[PDB]
Design a protein around this ligand. Structure first.
Ligand SMILES: Cc1ccncc1NC(=O)Cc1cccc(O)c1
Ligand SMILES: Cc1ccncc1NC(=O)Cc1cccc(O)c1
Lengths: 304, 304
């Protein structure tokens, strides 16, 4: 009973967080095996950020300039290298708390937990969706760079995001763990357009199934629709076009509840055209798109 | 930039979770020092739950009947006792992962993180408020009993809740770590009235301050109100009456933003009387009451 915006337990990730200082800048690093990963802008001063020549800035740095501290212990840096927008600092000690892990590049519309950190210390954990425009609407202040996003399948942490930047619009940008930015963003102090965003249709449908499973059924109607008809409505309301692949991923939820995907699409169509009429669904007064069909199945069954 | 329903990092609590089995029932236990805490209904069968005589049911149990497993290792039970609705199983080994901790009884309107667990394994973490009627709107399925709520001040975990029960209405009930239920609830399979709930006024005001700090300002108006006038509106809309003590706790947020508490009350009064007019605040289409003034200050400053 009940449905919450649930994050993964952050324990395996807390054990990997470290503080990285270079010159006067301090941010967070991710210590896995004998490598510490952090945003490459740790080597910049606030003045350098207009248009930094990272290659030139890193050439002035040596292993001993990167101060890496795991809580209270100091790590010895024996190598440094830049891969895309991340720095990899080789340390002489493998992190004893390194969990089984993978580095994954998630797709837009997928979700993940963020362990927000400051000075190498965890402050909190929250669940995010990677927007269709490759930004995340997180909660990050100065010093949060290097905080990571992740998913966990049993004992394996799949790291998918590292926080790098806040856009002038207050939304967030970052990279995969190979330092490749999601979206068109550059690690520079310049105005950067985030693309037109859309609502993640398949996630809203998955969340409508979670509502039905939990007893919120008022939005169910006597109608049905087709992919073509629904997509004309999705277009008008800036929703992602629904594909057969999206319908296929909704299969388990359609099977458990006995509500065909296109019938749930007709409920979503009516909610888009008429609003909620001052009512709520799972404690929300808007259509939630931060739960994937997998998240709904996991939460509704109790997967640990 | 940004504001999220953030939970505490759950790492220190994950290290304390164990599985407790007695007879045919399995649930979660909290292992701190050499004691494992769990709901006393672990000793019941589904048939016993109509009106269990817990004293009599526990008399038929011996130390060896409580199977306690921490992941893959088996704990040796050397004592058992019932305190209110919790069982305390003394084990021969102190948990090496026991953090600095306290047991606290939180007040209604206060918030905390829940580490949902099944079979002693963590599934996810979310932030909750203890409702004014002493229920929590969580996300719990069968097997989640024994999952705990907590807050963390630097390195100290203050355990405030242990999950025991789901009411016929789909809301949740539980105890403090001394086994005292929050609210009038009993650990029986009987219909139990949850009191009339109200919205946590001071939390909604704190969240309006968080909105202003983050740039959502459209609801700010040219009006002011008094405690008496605002409370006539709070009464009509089932909001908790605002007291000078609530105003006093809002002081830091009033000081940081320069918006007097009664002026923010006039914005809340207008939002109650007129609705959001199809707009949102911090990504919500309703008035959020699950962030305390302390939560807002902590998140807005970056406390770890
Ligand atoms: C201040 C802040 C708040 C929340 N999240 C991140 C930040 N920091 C930055 O954006 C640092 C930066 C990174 C690339 C380019 C820059 O010019 C500046
Ligand atoms: C099934 C479930 C779902 C979510 N949270 C908890 C539960 N379990 C219970 O309520 C067990 C119980 C506890 C006291 C009395 C009872 O009759 C039954």
């Amino acid at each position: 009973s009940g449905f919450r915006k649930m994050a993964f337990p952050s324990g395996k990730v807390e054990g990997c967080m470290v503080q990285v200082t270079c010159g006067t800048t301090t941010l967070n690093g991710l210590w896995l095996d004998d490598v510490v990963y952090c945003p490459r802008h740790v080597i910049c001063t606030s003045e350098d950020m207009l248009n930094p020549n990272y290659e030139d800035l890193l050439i002035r740095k040596s292993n001993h300039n990167f101060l890496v501290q795991a809580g209270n212990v100091q790590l010895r840096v024996i190598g440094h290298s830049m891969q895309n927008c991340v720095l990899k600092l080789k340390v002489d000690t493998a992190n004893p708390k390194t969990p089984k892990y993978k580095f994954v590049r998630i797709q837009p519309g997928q979700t993940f937990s963020v362990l927000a950190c400051y000075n190498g210390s965890p402050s909190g954990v929250y669940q995010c969706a990677m927007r269709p425009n490759f930004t995340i609407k997180g909660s990050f202040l100065n010093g949060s760079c290097g905080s990571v996003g992740f998913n966990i399948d049993y004992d394996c942490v799949s790291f998918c995001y590292m926080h790098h930047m806040e856009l002038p619009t207050g939304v967030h940008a970052g990279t995969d763990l190979e330092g490749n930015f999601y979206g068109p963003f550059v690690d520079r102090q310049t105005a950067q357009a985030a693309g037109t965003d859309t609502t993640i249709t398949v996630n809203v449908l998955a969340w409508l199934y979670a509502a039905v499973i939990n007893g919120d059924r008022w939005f169910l109607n006597r109608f049905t629709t087709t992919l073509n008809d629904f997509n004309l409505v999705a277009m008008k309301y800036n929703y992602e076009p629904l594909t057969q692949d999206h319908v296929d991923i909704l299969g388990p939820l359609s099977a458990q509840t006995g509500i065909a995907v296109l019938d749930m699409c007709a409920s979503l169509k009516e909610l888009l055209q008429n609003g909620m009429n001052g009512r709520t669904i799972l404690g929300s007064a808007l259509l939630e798109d931060e739960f994937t069909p997998f998240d709904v199945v996991r939460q509704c069954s109790g997967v640990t």
